[PDB]
Each structure stands twice: as C-alpha cells, then as structure tokens.
C-alpha cells in the first residue's frame, strides 16, 4: 500500500523534472554574457552601533530605513536609530535565548522569539515598553518572525512547521506544515500574498499566506538553508545554506536560475537580503565577513570585511540606502 | 541641537547607562553551563540541591553557575546548540549502566567535540548510575565485550585510584567507559578545551563541588592560554 | 534533491554476506562524512558504520565490529558497506543518511528520527 504510493510519487517527480527540463531554454548567465559588468561595490561602515553586551542573533530594519532593532543573548532588544546611533528603546527579554527579531511595517510593534518558544510582541509605541502578547504553541524553537501587519505574524519554527497567528486572539490561524526538518528562515513577499522559507531540508517551498498550504517547493540546495528573501520584483528569491552557496530561484520557472558560490568560499550562510534593484544579493558568511554578488552575472563584486567574529543577521532598507550586518562580535555596523 | 535632538541624546545616554548596570550585575562572578545526555541518565538530578528551556542556578563559593537544560526541542539538535558557544563547559551526563545507547552516546560525545561551534567548549563528562553499573557488573549477565570488542585487549590504567570498597572487575568497566571517552576526547583537541572525568551516582551530594573545581580549571587554563603561559 | 536510494540486501541465512550499495544525487559527495545507521524493527535507530570525507578515518559500533566493513567511491558516487559472516541480530532497515555539513567532521544530527538527509532503506532479514 505504500510502495504503490511512493512509485506514484516518483513519478510525479520525473514528471515535475521532465517539465522543468524542458523550460530551461538557457540560463540567465548563458543570456547575459553581453552585459557589462557592475564594477567594484566598495562600502565603508558608516556608523558603527555598538552597545550590545554580547552576541547578537538577528536584526530587522524598520520600514522607515531609520530604526533598526536587534536582538542579543544579552537579554536586550535594542531599537537603534542609525541616523543619530540613539537607542530609543531597550527592551528586557524575559529569556535571554532569543534567536530572531522583527520590526512591523507601521512601526507601532516589534517582536523576538527564540528557544523559549514564545512569539513576544510588544508595544514600541505605548502611552505609558511591556509584553503586549506570548503567542505559544509552536514545539520547537523560533527561527525567524515577519510581520504582516500589526495584527497578523507569521513566526517559523523549530518544529517543521511555520504557522500564522492572529496576534490579538492569541492563537495560530493558519499552520503551514510541510517541511521535513527545522524551518530555518523566513520572507514576505513585496505584495505580501507569498513566504519562501528555506529549512533544515535543503528545501525552499512557496506557502500562500490565505490558501493555507504548500504552492512549489524548489529542492536545489545539499545541507540546511539559513537565509532567505525575495527578490525586489516579487518572482524570485535567493537562499543561502550550510553547504556556502547562494542559490537564486524564480517562482514562475519553478527551478533554479543561478548559483553563487566559489572554491574559494567555505563557510555557510547565515543571512542574505536582496538590493533595492535586486542587482546586489548581499550575503553572510560564517568566515567573519560578508560577500555582496551580482544576481545577474552570478559574479562576486565586492566585500564587506570588519566584522571580528561571526556575521549573524544583514538586512537592507527598504529605499536600499544602506545594509546594517549584526555579527557576533556584539556590533551592528551599517554599510553605506 | 534642537530640543528633541537633545532629548533623544540624553534618553539614549541613560538606556547606555542602564545596559552598563544591568550588564555589570548580571554577568560579573557568574557562569552558564549547558547540561546535556539522554533520558535515562541523571539529567535533571546530577545536582540534587539548589534546584521550554530549563534551568538552574547555583552557587558553590560565592560563584553563580546557570546550568541550563533543553528538553522540549526535536530531535536534530544540529541547530539550537549553537546558541551555547559561549558557556564556560558543557555537563555531559552517561548512562554507564546500559551499554546499548552507551555507543550513541560516544557519537553524541564526538559530534560535540568536533562541532565548529562547540570547539572551543570543555567537557564536564559525568559517567553516572556507576551503583547500577557495579550490580550489572556483578550479576555478569550482560557482558560489556559484546557491545565492545575493544574489552578484551584493554587493560586498567595504572594511574586509576580504586575506591575503598571495588570490584577489579568494577573498575575496569567504568575506566573502560572513561577511557573509551577520552579516546575522542584526546582524538582532535586543539588545546581550546578539555573534558573532565567524573564519575558519580545519583546519590552523590559532590557534584557541585566538581563542577566548581572543573570550571575553575576551564577557566585558569584559557587565562593561561590568553597569558600565553599555556 | 538530495537524494538516497539504497540497493542490495535482502534475505541471508547467518554467516552470508550481502553487499549494501546506494546511489547518491543531488550533493557533492566527496564533501560528506557519511555514515550506515540501521533501524531494527521495535528498537530505535542505532548507528552502525562510518568514514571519513577522503575515507581515511573509519569507524564501526562495537556489536559489529570487523565483521562489517564500509567504502567509499567518489567517482561512483555510491556508499559501499560490506557485511561479511552476518548475524540473526543484523536483521533491520539500513540508511546511508550523509551528514548535513560538508568540510566538516563533526556529524552531529544523524540518528534522528526524522532526519531530513537519510536514504530510503534496505530491509535486510536475517534468518
């Protein structure tokens, strides 16, 4: 009763190869070998945020591209302002194990999570900073939180499963279950219809926020994905794993696009985030420092070296001005 | 210059402020210890006084220890222990008296070792249910060689301090155990760290003097090494 | 996809040999420490044999030591563990689940029950 099933299900797979197959009529580096290249993409950090008493694990910067907020196993979740390196808030975290933190799109809220396996929101903007909610359930540890709106969260988690929650009513809505092993990272779409995230399967799958399941799962990546985001234009994302390689996949092929990787690299990654023009496909590697690609000719166009230990957390702002790289060396540093 | 400019300068020179006290009092004469092993080992009573993720806070002579314990993740722990790179050793507890996950807990204990992460992170390995262990031994229904071939040509180290009241037969099996753990222990150390031996039983009060001892040594040798006297 | 799918095994009076191979897609498998755990119906998933990313270090669990014996061809991208004078105990489903790092030694997750890199498996029954 099972091996009928699983010969179905791999024939359903030599099927969705076959097609993909036959889509790949060339490749974007095969249709761009005329383009001329970007250049050297030199960056110095630009304001350097220090403060942090110990490693930092994650950072969101805020839909205005001024206020950052970072989350460390200190115990603290900073919002920093980087235009005048002013701390405006310095939340106490009840479990100094948090592992990600978001900044929502309003900017009326911000949110940690980590192996307490507790969402915790908060109000930034209060009239009195206190726990607004605890949202539980998940059985693993949290991994990566975005914010739809204020009211709506989407938290991926340890336990294979990434679920929706309804912030107010206090529990998951909807649970996108699916993976095989731990979700590692999450992405919300330009229009915030689809997430992408990659997990401990070495697969990326395209959840619909509202349909409630699975839509494609793009399966191109050897070890555990750590990083993920869309690409500016909405149809594609790039994903970082173990096995140090940047992989750009388009939702429409519904295959690989590019691979970003070199002998010469080692170390995984740990965070990637796509330029404002998705031109640039900065990314984190374990080797103290950051590469910054180039999507379109998969070729390496710069570095953002000055990092003294691990680099955790990138992120770019949403006008692309600049990208903050939080490593473990408890410094933030934003690179313009 | 404005008003609000300086408002925002003085509130962030005060949030400085804060993080500095708060820091100072939280991280001075204090040490976090990950406890790791598996259910049937002592994992929650190694320490039996001064009692999601877990947690324990004692203190031997005026040094805080925040002994921490996962137990409600899955089973890959590949990922969540990173976040324990920092802690000054890590509690490794075994159950010597069943030889059959005794195997898996070597490959725990190598994984550990050779992890990237976990590199620079000494071992407090406590061999534990060394009571059930000596009535297993005894009764001799369950031989250690077949779930080790290895018994047969080792012999009992000479340094080995046999306790008051032992059986040869008693201490060749838990030194067995020790040796078999300081086989990986020893494999690949790059000096960063070093694995600790102590054997206890579930009724021992010392354990918290051990880890004491242990991390005192953890600590003096990576100022050693900092010093480069070592 | 990572992909493993196991070939070989089968039926085997004691003391028989049967040859375990499986095919291995997807990743570069020169870069993988791999390894041979066995899951032994009603007892849990017990790790069995290992080697190293160029084959130079080699280990095995106690109960099966010297009578099983593991290779690695690069070029064939095949795991090869070759139980010689089997056991009515051997009787159990073999994975060649790789490890999820590469350029490392450290294979810290594998035995998981739900371990996202591991092969199909090969029921061998031994009688």
């Known amino acids: 009763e099972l091996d009928q099933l699983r010969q179905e299900a791999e024939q359903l797979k030599n099927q969705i190869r076959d097609a993909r197959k036959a889509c790949a009529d060339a490749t974007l580096s095969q249709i761009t070998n005329n383009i001329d290249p970007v250049g050297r993409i030199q960056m110095r950090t630009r304001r350097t945020l220090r403060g942090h008493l110990a490693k930092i694990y994650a950072m969101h910067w805020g839909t205005d591209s001024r206020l950052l907020v970072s989350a460390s196993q200190d115990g603290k979740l900073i919002i920093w302002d980087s235009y005048t390196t002013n701390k405006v808030h310095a939340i106490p975290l009840r479990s100094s194990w948090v592992m990600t933190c978001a900044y929502a799109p309003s900017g009326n809220y911000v949110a940690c999570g980590g192996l307490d396996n507790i969402c915790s929101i908060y109000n930034l903007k209060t009239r009195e900073v206190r726990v607004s909610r605890e949202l539980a359930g998940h059985t693993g540890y949290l991994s990566c939180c975005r914010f739809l709106d204020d009211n709506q969260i989407v938290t991926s988690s340890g336990d294979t499963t990434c679920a929706l929650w309804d912030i107010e009513t206090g529990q998951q809505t909807t649970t996108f279950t699916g993976h095989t092993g731990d979700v590692m990272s999450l992405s919300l779409a330009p229009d915030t219809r689809l997430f992408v995230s990659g997990a401990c399967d070495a697969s990326a799958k395209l959840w619909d926020v509202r349909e409630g399941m699975c839509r494609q799962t793009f399966t191109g990546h050897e070890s555990d994905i750590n990083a993920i985001c869309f690409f500016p234009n909405g149809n594609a994302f790039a994903t970082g794993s173990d096995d140090a390689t940047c992989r750009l996949f388009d939702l429409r092929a519904d295959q690989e696009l590019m691979t970003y990787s070199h002998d010469n690299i080692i170390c995984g990654i740990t965070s990637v985030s796509f330029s404002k023009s998705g031109r640039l496909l900065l990314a984190g590697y374990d080797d103290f420092n950051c590469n910054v690609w180039d999507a379109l000719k998969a070729d390496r166009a710069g570095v953002l070296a000055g990092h003294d230990n691990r680099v955790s957390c990138l992120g770019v702002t949403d006008d692309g001005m600049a990208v903050a790289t939080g490593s473990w060396d408890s410094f933030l540093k934003i690179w313009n | 210059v404005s008003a609000e400019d300086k408002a925002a300068a003085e509130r962030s020179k005060m949030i400085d402020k804060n993080l500095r006290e708060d820091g100072e009092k939280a991280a001075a004469a204090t040490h976090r210890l990950l406890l790791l092993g598996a259910d049937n080992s002592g994992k929650s009573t190694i320490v039996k006084q001064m009692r999601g993720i877990f947690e324990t806070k004692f203190q031997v002579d005026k040094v805080n220890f925040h002994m921490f314990d996962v137990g409600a993740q899955r089973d890959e722990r590949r990922k969540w222990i990173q976040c324990f790179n920092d802690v000054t050793a890590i509690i490794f507890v075994v159950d010597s008296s069943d030889y059959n996950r005794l195997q898996e807990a070597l490959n725990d204990f190598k994984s550990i070792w050779n992890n990237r992460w976990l590199r620079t992170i000494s071992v407090i390995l406590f061999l534990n249910k060394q009571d059930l262990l000596a009535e297993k031994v005894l009764a001799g229904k369950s031989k250690i060689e077949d779930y080790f071939p290895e018994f047969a040509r080792y012999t009992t180290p000479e340094d080995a301090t046999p306790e008051p009241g032992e059986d040869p037969r008693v201490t060749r099996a838990k030194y067995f155990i020790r040796d078999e753990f300081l086989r990986i222990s020893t494999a690949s150390g790059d000096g960063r760290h070093y694995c600790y031996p102590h054997f206890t039983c579930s009724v021992d009060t010392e354990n918290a003097r051990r880890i004491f001892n242990d991390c005192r040594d953890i600590i003096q040798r990576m100022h050693l090494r900092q010093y480069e006297l070592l | 996809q990572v992909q493993l799918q196991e070939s070989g095994g089968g039926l085997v009076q004691p003391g028989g040999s049967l040859r375990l191979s499986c095919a291995a897609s997807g990743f570069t498998f020169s870069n993988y420490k791999m390894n041979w755990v066995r899951q032994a119906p009603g007892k849990g998933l017990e790790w069995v044999s290992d080697?190293?990313?160029?084959?130079?270090?080699?280990s095995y669990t106690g109960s099966v030591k010297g009578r099983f014996t593991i290779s690695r061809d690069n070029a064939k991208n095949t795991l090869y563990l070759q139980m010689n004078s089997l056991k009515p105990e051997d009787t159990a489903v073999y994975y060649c689940?790789?490890?999820?790092?590469?350029?490392?030694?450290?294979?810290?997750?594998?035995?998981?029950?739900?371990?996202?890199?591991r092969g199909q498996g090969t029921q061998v029954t031994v009688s």
């Open positions: 080697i190293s990313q160029s084959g130079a270090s080699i």
């Open positions: 689940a790789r490890c999820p790092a590469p350029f490392t030694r450290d294979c810290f997750d594998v035995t998981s029950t739900t371990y996202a890199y």
